[PDB]
């Protein structure tokens, strides 16, 4: 509906809409040949259908081609300083499609205006609608037009015969914010069956990771979505469909040490998996420093030859 | 439905704008891989 709207507001009064609680599909918009410019900052166009955003903003206006480049972070220009300024850390996509045949008319468009004068520059996502006469010189005009005192707004007069530099261009700016909140806008990705007690990848409402999901004794309040430990890592999530809290545990890992007598005697080796139970790895001895595979555990006691740990040592007979 | 021909024609018409006129493009790609060099400049050799 924002893309198909018949009329687009003026730049000095760019129209902002909020989008939430729906499933978006950016593949159609990106793959379409209609849009002329499609630039995404802080995100890539090919992955917008894989992410989830807390809230989407859609800002619509109409400019000309020569200044379409001014809709970008850290730009300098009349729009960049007086009409519509984007934040430096902008996260979103800017789409412009030529619109000669929608807006431009014989005689010129008098309904499309842009601010040409202002006392100071604008701030990001700030809209100014005041029509106070600008004091160009040092003479206070007290709201009276004349020399060194101009009306800030200035008309466009889009003529269909004008060159592409001055031709109408409809621009829509999709602004996404990726913060800690229950995301309401998500791509068209079908959900799958949930599995527990296994080392699996998980994508919970746009939060990716790898680990084991288990039933949790934690009691989340009915506003919290995910929990974190002391070290600030996501260790508990809420299922977006059943509202069931699941603990996240990183899959069992560790170091691997090779215990060997010198090759200069024999080629046999033993493998110690540090801090790892060897019912998780797929004769065999379980120690405090992990478990040892390839070494025979005995009742005897000798002087330590190869230190294993926790009072356990290994040697070649 | 929605099946369209994969190709499209430039239609280089002689009196066109500078953005539509035919420009010949040659791209030279150099391989700096470890190998005996075959192409060098006109740099003259010198006694060892």
């Amino acid at each position, epitope marked *: 509906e924002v893309f198909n709207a018949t009329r687009f507001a003026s730049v000095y009064a760019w129209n902002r809409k909020r989008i939430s609680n729906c499933v978006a599909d950016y593949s159609v918009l990106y793959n379409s040949a209609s849009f002329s410019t499609f630039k995404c900052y802080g995100v890539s166009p090919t992955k917008l259908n894989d992410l989830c955003f807390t809230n989407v903003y859609a800002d619509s206006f109409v400019i000309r081609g020569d200044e379409v480049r001014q809709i970008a972070p850290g730009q300098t220009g009349k729009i960049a300083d007086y009409n519509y300024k984007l934040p430096d850390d902008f996260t979103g996509c800017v789409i412009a499609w030529n619109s000669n045949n929608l807006d431009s008319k014989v005689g010129g468009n008098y309904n499309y205006l842009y601010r040409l004068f202002r006392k100071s520059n604008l701030k990001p996502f700030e809209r100014d609608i005041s029509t106070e006469i600008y004091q160009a010189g040092s003479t206070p005009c007290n709201g009276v037009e004349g020399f060194n005192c101009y009306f800030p707004l200035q008309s466009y007069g889009f003529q*269909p015969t004008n060159g592409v530099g001055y031709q109408p261009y409809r621009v829509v700016v999709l602004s996404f914010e990726l913060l800690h909140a229950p995301a309401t806008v998500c791509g068209p990705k079908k959900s799958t069956n949930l599995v527990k007690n296994k080392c699996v990848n998980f994508n919970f409402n746009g939060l990716t990771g790898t680990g084991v999901l288990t039933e949790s004794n934690k009691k989340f309040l009915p506003f919290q979505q995910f929990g974190r430990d002391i070290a600030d890592t996501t260790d508990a999530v809420r299922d977006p469909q059943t509202l069931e809290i699941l603990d996240i545990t990183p899959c069992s890992f560790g170091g691997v040490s090779v215990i060997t007598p010198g090759t200069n005697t024999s080629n046999q080796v033993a493998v110690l998996y540090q801090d790892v139970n060897c019912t998780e790895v797929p004769n065999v001895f379980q120690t405090r420093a992990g478990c040892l595979i390839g070494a025979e555990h005995v009742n005897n006691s000798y002087e330590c030859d190869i230190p294993i740990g926790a009072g356990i040592c290994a040697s070649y007979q | 439905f929605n099946c369209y021909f994969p190709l499209q024609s430039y239609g280089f018409q002689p009196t066109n*704008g500078v953005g539509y006129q035919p420009y010949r493009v040659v791209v030279l790609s150099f391989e700096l891989l470890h190998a005996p060099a075959t192409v060098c400049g006109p740099k003259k050799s010198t006694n060892l």
Partner: antibody, heavy 126, light 105 residues
Framework: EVQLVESGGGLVQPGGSLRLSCAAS????????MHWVRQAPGKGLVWVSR????????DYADSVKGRFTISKDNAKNTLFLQMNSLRTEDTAVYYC???????????????????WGRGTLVTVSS | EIVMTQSPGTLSLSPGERATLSCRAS???????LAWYQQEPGQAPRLLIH???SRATGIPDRFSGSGSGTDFTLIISRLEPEDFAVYYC?????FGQGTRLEIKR
């Protein structure tokens, strides 16, 4: 099939008022821009007016500036063209014409017509 | 604003001989979005070619023209007894004076 039927017209004294209707059948009226084209008796064609998908904007020609009003009643599937202070030189036949649209992600008209309905002759004289 | 000028004003040929016609935009270029219409005197005008290159579906393949910049030409491959009409070119805001494709005797 797709056709446009024009209704109204006739002899009206100079300075009078008249309203013309354009009923469209065979296609979806809502998605297409519409225009009006005049044809003077034994003369060339001249563009008159232009209307959007809902009628927000108008593209009234200089000849008909301030005297002709076009309306697009999408709910009851009709186009309307009503004028005031009509002058003698405007004697012609009117053509209700359509604007081609791609109907893709963006409607994107192309300023070329597709079908022409049967014209309606209008006359003004004393 | 923009004025369409048609050349030649009139053009008569044999019933089989082909012909070409050229329109002239007064100034500037309009992205080559030009249309030709053939109007039989009794009937309403009919679209022939749109965007100055591509011919509308249902029109005979014989009608095939192309142009760019100031000039847009349409050329007809052959002729039959249907050219007794006026060919008007149409850009955004104006129609051409037209040309009567006559039959020679």
């Amino acid at each position: 099939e797709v056709q446009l039927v024009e209704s109204g017209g006739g002899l009206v004294q100079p300075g009078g008022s008249l309203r013309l209707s354009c009923a469209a059948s065979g296609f979806t009226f809502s998605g297409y821009w519409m225009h009006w084209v005049r044809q003077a008796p034994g003369k060339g064609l001249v563009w008159v007016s232009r209307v959007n998908r809902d009628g927000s904007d108008a593209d009234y020609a200089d000849s008909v500036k301030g005297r002709f009003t076009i309306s697009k009643d999408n709910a009851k599937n009709t186009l309307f063209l009503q004028m005031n202070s009509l002058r003698t030189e405007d004697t012609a036949v009117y053509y209700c014409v359509r604007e081609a649209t791609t109907f893709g992600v963006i409607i994107m008209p192309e300023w070329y017509f597709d079908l022409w309905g049967r014209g309606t002759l209008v006359t003004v004289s004393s | 604003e923009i004025v369409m000028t048609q050349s030649p004003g009139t053009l008569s040929l044999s019933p089989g001989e082909r012909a070409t016609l050229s329109c002239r935009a007064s100034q500037s270029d309009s992205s080559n979005s030009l249309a030709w219409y053939q109007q039989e005197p009794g009937q309403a005008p009919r679209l022939l070619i749109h965007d100055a290159s591509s011919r509308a579906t249902g029109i005979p393949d014989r009608f095939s023209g192309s142009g760019s910049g100031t000039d847009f030409t349409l050329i007809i491959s052959r002729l039959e007894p249907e050219d007794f009409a006026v060919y008007y070119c149409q850009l955004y805001g104006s129609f051409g004076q037209g040309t009567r494709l006559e039959i020679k005797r």
